[PDB]
Design a protein around this motif. Structure first.
Motif, PDB file in Angstrom:
ATOM      1  N   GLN C  28       0.885  -1.202   0.000  1.00  0.00           N
ATOM      2  CA  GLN C  28       0.000   0.000   0.000  1.00  0.00           C
ATOM      3  C   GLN C  28       0.917   1.246   0.000  1.00  0.00           C
ATOM      4  OE1 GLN C  28      -3.146   0.954   2.941  1.00  0.00           O
ATOM      5  NE2 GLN C  28      -2.861  -1.075   3.791  1.00  0.00           N
ATOM      6  N   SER C  29       0.362   2.426  -0.296  1.00  0.00           N
ATOM      7  CA  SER C  29       1.102   3.697  -0.225  1.00  0.00           C
ATOM      8  C   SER C  29       1.666   3.884   1.186  1.00  0.00           C
ATOM      9  CB  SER C  29       0.258   4.874  -0.608  1.00  0.00           C
ATOM     10  OG  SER C  29       0.930   6.041  -0.142  1.00  0.00           O
ATOM     11  N   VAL C  30       2.954   4.169   1.271  1.00  0.00           N
ATOM     12  CA  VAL C  30       3.625   4.498   2.556  1.00  0.00           C
ATOM     13  C   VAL C  30       4.189   5.910   2.425  1.00  0.00           C
ATOM     14  CG1 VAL C  30       4.074   2.120   3.322  1.00  0.00           C
ATOM     15  CG2 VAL C  30       5.734   3.291   1.897  1.00  0.00           C
ATOM     16  N   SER C  31       3.595   6.726   1.558  1.00  0.00           N
ATOM     17  CA  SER C  31       4.139   8.044   1.203  1.00  0.00           C
ATOM     18  C   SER C  31       5.638   7.833   0.937  1.00  0.00           C
ATOM     19  CB  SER C  31       3.783   9.040   2.293  1.00  0.00           C
ATOM     20  OG  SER C  31       4.102  10.333   1.859  1.00  0.00           O
ATOM     21  N   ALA C  33       7.912   7.319   3.463  1.00  0.00           N
ATOM     22  CA  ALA C  33       8.361   6.890   4.818  1.00  0.00           C
ATOM     23  C   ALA C  33       9.148   5.558   4.743  1.00  0.00           C
ATOM     24  CB  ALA C  33       7.133   6.783   5.699  1.00  0.00           C
ATOM     25  N   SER C  51      13.386   8.910   4.612  1.00  0.00           N
ATOM     26  CA  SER C  51      12.341   9.423   3.702  1.00  0.00           C
ATOM     27  C   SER C  51      12.698   9.191   2.240  1.00  0.00           C
ATOM     28  CB  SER C  51      11.985  10.884   3.939  1.00  0.00           C
ATOM     29  OG  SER C  51      11.571  11.026   5.265  1.00  0.00           O
ATOM     30  N   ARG C  67      12.082   7.089  -5.191  1.00  0.00           N
ATOM     31  CA  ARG C  67      10.722   6.545  -5.096  1.00  0.00           C
ATOM     32  C   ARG C  67      10.019   6.739  -6.420  1.00  0.00           C
ATOM     33  NH1 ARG C  67       5.705   9.465  -1.969  1.00  0.00           N
ATOM     34  NH2 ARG C  67       4.195   7.869  -2.628  1.00  0.00           N
ATOM     35  N   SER C  92       8.012   3.144   7.919  1.00  0.00           N
ATOM     36  CA  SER C  92       7.632   3.654   9.251  1.00  0.00           C
ATOM     37  C   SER C  92       6.358   4.474   9.106  1.00  0.00           C
ATOM     38  CB  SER C  92       8.751   4.477   9.893  1.00  0.00           C
ATOM     39  OG  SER C  92       9.268   5.428   8.949  1.00  0.00           O
ATOM     40  N   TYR C  93       5.644   4.338   7.977  1.00  0.00           N
ATOM     41  CA  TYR C  93       4.377   5.068   7.756  1.00  0.00           C
ATOM     42  C   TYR C  93       3.298   4.504   8.703  1.00  0.00           C
ATOM     43  CZ  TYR C  93       0.855   7.955   5.538  1.00  0.00           C
ATOM     44  OH  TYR C  93      -0.152   8.852   5.347  1.00  0.00           O
ATOM     45  N   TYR C  94       3.070   3.210   8.656  1.00  0.00           N
ATOM     46  CA  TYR C  94       2.047   2.520   9.473  1.00  0.00           C
ATOM     47  C   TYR C  94       2.797   1.757  10.580  1.00  0.00           C
ATOM     48  CZ  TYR C  94      -1.161   3.425   5.508  1.00  0.00           C
ATOM     49  OH  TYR C  94      -1.936   4.081   4.578  1.00  0.00           O
TER      50      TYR C  94
END
Ligand SMILES: [Cl-]
Ligand SMILES: [Cl-]
Ligand SMILES: [Cl-]
Lengths: 222, 248, 214
Positions: C28-31, C33, C51, C67, C92-94
């Protein structure tokens, strides 16, 4: 200036408990987020637990949740991992780490980076066991030449093997241990030698199993 | 918070009585609602294919704010702003969510309400039980208007619209009570009247930051608000600017 | 419901001066992170990139990160000797925090066929009631090898275990052992014990065998 040093690793049985500590210097744990990350022999990094020390808020991987408790003593500047209901898969190097994030507040589009782990200790080994058992050692006899020792039926890891008390290191290969259906470990150590040396040169494998305080010297002849 | 460094998660408000979570998940076909004190039962709506309104009342439970925040991917500095209830209304745009801080008036009382819009949730954070959102609840429950056919961006519109309508009703109600008290010269009536006038003064201060928030939600909106929903946000904004000032 | 971080490849071989590329894909999207860590044998991980693309203080500029949506790349523009190591990505997003599987960067060398040795079980071992027959493949490259066991022309399955070394520091080769475990009673029923080896370095299979009795 910043340092994390883990300690408290050793032997532990299911039924037993073990407390790991991470002593922090150069910063105050009170305003920090501290993590435990573990690595099982020959495997990757797995996050275990984290503590936000200011509120005491704790977070756990599902694999340890309800078994391990993370805490922080903000007068000793030390974090702890209390390990209960131990299982064989808990056997691992445990590392303590601090996270940081970079930011600038303000505007409609704030610059907020998510955390990463800047400072790590060198890790502490936790070995889970039911029984300690020393190995049986057997020759792999030679007939350009290969000879060896089969180191069978020990628990837990590790075993070290040396050759002619450390005088023979070249051409030496000590394999990683395999877990047998018996739940006991086995490994072999081999060395290739000029055939010319066998008959004349003695070849002794020195086997050391520290958990059982077992040292065994096996002469290996044709 | 003067002593505390950046990133310190501390509730700065005065309400520590109530704690409940209320969920409403809905689609064109059906809706489901429940109340709980078990945060673990709301986490799965993060991944829901249909829109969810999660309402967390009692941010004094900073453990619950952290749990929800960390699972939903909300940055720690946004969680710091949710818990710090002494700040000017504002809107902040991130890649996966919109963060909005508003005041809600409800014996006049103020509380901060935080809203996080993701692609499939509105997370709403309140200090104390009681709000102005019952009419949105009623539209979900009885399938009135178009809310059940739209996504979480329209849910955000609907909540902000309820807040703005209530605000303008409220300060009409306060003007009327003030006119009556002035027709009424007992010490209690006079001190009460002066109290209601100071209350009206604080109400009208909040229009300025609210208009800043409403402006950002309809002018160059980010992708979490769909083109088709922008005209609804423009109507809420427009409703704030109707009786304009004059220089003559 | 944990975010999975699929890192590739598990291992790659390279020479000094190579551009090396390691990939990580978020489920899934983790921006942005995502961080990258290096680890050498017996040492703690070291932060290289945070990042997705910020180089950490003191890290050489030959490391870069980038990215594209849920695809993340670590690039070593020109590999140096000290960069042979394991690399991990982390989101480290979620929470919970999740790591990639790891990528081991190994030393490229030329194909080298194994030398094969067979060892019968010692008399010492047979006295206790078990017989281990050991097949050694020594000093070969690359790591992939197949060993098949045969007892009186019967193909053995489910009674052997293999163990492989990490790349040797001096010659960049691997060695492997396959151990066939039998009860003494079963070992004494059969005559011919053989292991058959296939390897990229071998133009046909190699068999070493003995007759129980010598
Ligand atoms: Cl010792
Ligand atoms: Cl409209
Ligand atoms: Cl990919």
């Amino acid at each position: 200036e910043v340092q994390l040093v883990e300690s408290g690793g050793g032997l532990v049985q299911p039924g037993g408990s073990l407390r790991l500590s991470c002593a922090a210097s150069g910063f105050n744990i009170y305003y920090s987020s501290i993590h435990w990350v573990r690595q099982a022999p020959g495997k990757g990094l797995e996050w275990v637990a984290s503590i936000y020390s200011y509120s005491g808020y704790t977070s756990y991987a599902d694999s340890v949740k309800g078994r391990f408790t993370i805490s922080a003593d903000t007068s000793k500047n030390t974090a702890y991992l209390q390990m209960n209901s131990l299982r064989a898969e808990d056997t691992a190097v445990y590392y303590c780490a601090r996270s940081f994030y970079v930011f600038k507040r303000g505007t409609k589009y704030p610059y907020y980076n998510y955390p990463a782990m800047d400072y790590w200790g060198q890790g502490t080994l936790v070995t889970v066991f039911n029984q300690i058992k020393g190995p049986s050692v057997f020759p792999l006899a030679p007939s350009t030449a290969a000879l060896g020792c089969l180191v069978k039926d020990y628990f837990p890891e590790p075993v070290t093997v040396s050759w002619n008390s450390g005088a023979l290191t070249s051409g030496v290969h000590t394999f990683p241990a395999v877990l047998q259906s018996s739940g006991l470990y086995s490994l072999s150590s081999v060395v290739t030698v000029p055939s010319s040396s066998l008959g004349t040169q003695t070849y002794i494998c020195n086997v050391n199993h520290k958990p059982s305080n077992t040292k065994v010297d096996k002469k290996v002849e044709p | 918070k003067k002593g505390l460094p950046p990133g310190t998660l501390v509730y700065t408000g005065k309400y520590r009585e109530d704690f409940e979570i209320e969920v409403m998940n809905y689609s064109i076909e059906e809706f489901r609602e429940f109340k709980t004190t078990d945060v673990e039962s709301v986490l799965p709506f993060r991944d829901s294919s249909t829109p969810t309104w999660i309402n967390i009342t009692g941010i004094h439970r900073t453990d619950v704010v952290q749990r929800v925040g960390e699972f939903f991917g909300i940055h720690p500095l946004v969680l710091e702003d949710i818990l710090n209830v002494h700040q000017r209304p504002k809107v902040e745009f991130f890649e996966n969510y919109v963060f909005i801080v508003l005041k809600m008036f409800t014996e006049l009382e103020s509380e901060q309400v935080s809203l996080i819009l993701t692609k499939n949730c509105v997370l709403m954070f309140q200090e104390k039980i009681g709000d102005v959102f019952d009419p949105v609840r009623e539209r979900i429950r009885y399938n009135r208007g178009i809310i059940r056919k739209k996504r979480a961006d329209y849910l955000l519109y609907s909540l902000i619209d309820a807040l703005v309508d209530d605000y303008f009703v409220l300060l009409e109600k306060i003007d009327d009570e003030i006119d009556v008290l002035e027709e009424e010269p007992e010490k209690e009536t006079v001190q009460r009247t002066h109290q209601l006038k100071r209350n009206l003064v604080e109400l009208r201060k909040t229009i300025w930051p609210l208009r800043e928030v409403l402006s950002s939600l309809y002018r160059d909106v980010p992708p979490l608000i769909e083109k088709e929903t922008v005209p609804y946000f423009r109507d809420v904004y427009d409703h704030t600017i109707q009786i304009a000032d004059t220089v003559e | 419901s944990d975010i999975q971080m699929t890192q590739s490849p598990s291992s790659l071989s390279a020479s000094v001066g190579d551009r090396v590329t390691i990939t990580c894909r978020a489920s899934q999207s983790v921006s942005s992170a995502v961080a990258w860590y290096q680890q050498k044998p017996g040492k703690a991980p070291k932060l290289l990139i945070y990042s997705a693309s910020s180089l950490y203080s003191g890290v050489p500029s030959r490391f870069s990160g980038s990215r594209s949506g849920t695809d993340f790349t670590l690039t070593i523009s020109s590999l140096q000797p000290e960069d042979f190591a394991t690399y991990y990505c982390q989101q480290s997003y979620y929470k919970p925090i999740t790591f990639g599987q790891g990528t081991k960067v190994e030393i490229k060398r030329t194909v080298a066929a194994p030398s094969v040795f067979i060892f019968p079980p010692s008399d010492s071992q047979l006295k206790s009631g078990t017989a281990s027959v050991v097949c050694l493949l020594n000093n070969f490259y690359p790591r992939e090898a197949k060993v098949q066991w045969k007892v009186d022309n019967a193909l053995q399955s489910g009674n052997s275990q293999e163990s492989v070394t990490e790349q040797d520091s001096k010659d960049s080769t691997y060695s492997l052992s396959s151990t066939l475990t039998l009860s003494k009673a079963d070992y004494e029923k059969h005559k011919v014990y053989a292991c058959e080896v296939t390897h990229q370095g071998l133009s046909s299979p190699v068999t070493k065998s003995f007759n129980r009795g010598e």
